[PDB]
Design an enzyme around this catalytic site. Structure first.
Site, mmCIF file in Angstrom:
data_model
loop_
_atom_site.group_PDB
_atom_site.id
_atom_site.type_symbol
_atom_site.label_atom_id
_atom_site.label_comp_id
_atom_site.label_asym_id
_atom_site.label_seq_id
_atom_site.Cartn_x
_atom_site.Cartn_y
_atom_site.Cartn_z
ATOM 1 N N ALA A 15 30.039 77.134 -21.030
ATOM 2 C CA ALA A 15 28.949 76.313 -20.725
ATOM 3 C C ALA A 15 27.900 76.015 -22.038
ATOM 4 O O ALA A 15 27.433 74.990 -22.234
ATOM 5 C CB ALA A 15 28.134 76.795 -19.585
ATOM 6 N N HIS A 88 36.923 72.703 -20.039
ATOM 7 C CA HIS A 88 35.583 72.997 -20.264
ATOM 8 C C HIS A 88 34.878 73.590 -18.787
ATOM 9 O O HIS A 88 35.521 72.840 -17.898
ATOM 10 C CB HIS A 88 34.833 72.004 -20.750
ATOM 11 C CG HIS A 88 33.414 72.260 -21.305
ATOM 12 N ND1 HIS A 88 32.651 71.694 -21.535
ATOM 13 C CD2 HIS A 88 32.939 73.474 -21.474
ATOM 14 C CE1 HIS A 88 31.423 71.987 -22.048
ATOM 15 N NE2 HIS A 88 31.722 73.209 -22.156
ATOM 16 N N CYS A 89 34.061 74.656 -18.962
ATOM 17 C CA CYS A 89 33.525 75.081 -17.692
ATOM 18 C C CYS A 89 32.051 74.788 -18.206
ATOM 19 O O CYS A 89 31.566 75.081 -18.988
ATOM 20 C CB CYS A 89 33.721 76.518 -17.503
ATOM 21 S SG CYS A 89 33.381 77.070 -15.799
ATOM 22 N N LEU A 90 31.577 73.798 -17.310
ATOM 23 C CA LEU A 90 29.939 73.436 -17.751
ATOM 24 C C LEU A 90 29.080 74.392 -16.980
ATOM 25 O O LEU A 90 28.064 74.605 -17.564
ATOM 26 C CB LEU A 90 29.781 71.854 -16.858
ATOM 27 C CG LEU A 90 30.497 70.604 -17.642
ATOM 28 C CD1 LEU A 90 29.888 69.676 -17.085
ATOM 29 C CD2 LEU A 90 30.267 70.994 -19.100
#
Length: 146
Positions: A15, A88-90
């Site tokens: 994140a 991607h992990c937000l």
């Protein structure tokens, strides 16, 4: 901080990482997969760049989220084209971690331990999530069926 390279062309972002489309382009990343709790599933092509968002409910199910297959197809479709991919992990990381580990298990035939270790080698802050762990052991059992 910036996205880490798990394997050639395979990147993992948290994140807080600088998801700068220009940074990404420099690193030779044309694909981007945003894994995030409850966002609408969506995808689009920006000419060169490809973009996709898939949900990964962090709820107790032992259920994969039917998106594991798509996420893998997407990561696979990239790596096959010999070009960068960013998972991607937000919100945090657990979800994108469980996705890349799931990918490593199926496409590189690594066991959970080896796959998870590879990710811990490049991302030391990460911690295991029991729910996801349970889902990955489930996932590995299918693969084991052969």
């Amino acid at each position: 901080s910036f996205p880490v390279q798990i394997l050639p062309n395979l990147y993992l972002g948290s994140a807080r990482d600088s998801a700068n489309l220009e940074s990404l382009a420099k690193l030779g990343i044309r694909y981007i997969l945003n894994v995030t709790p409850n966002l609408p599933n969506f995808f689009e092509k920006n000419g060169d760049f490809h973009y996709k968002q898939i949900p990964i409910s962090d709820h107790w199910s032992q259920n994969l989220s039917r998106f594991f297959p798509e996420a893998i197809e997407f990561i696979d479709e990239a790596l096959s084209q010999n070009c960068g991919v960013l998972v991607h992990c937000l919100a945090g990381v657990s979800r994108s971690v469980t996705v890349t580990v799931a990918y490593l298990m199926q496409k590189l035939h690594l066991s959970l331990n080896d796959a998870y270790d590879l990710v811990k080698r490049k991302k030391s802050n990460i911690s295991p999530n029991f729910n996801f762990m349970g889902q990955l052991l489930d996932f590995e059992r299918s693969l084991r069926l052969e």
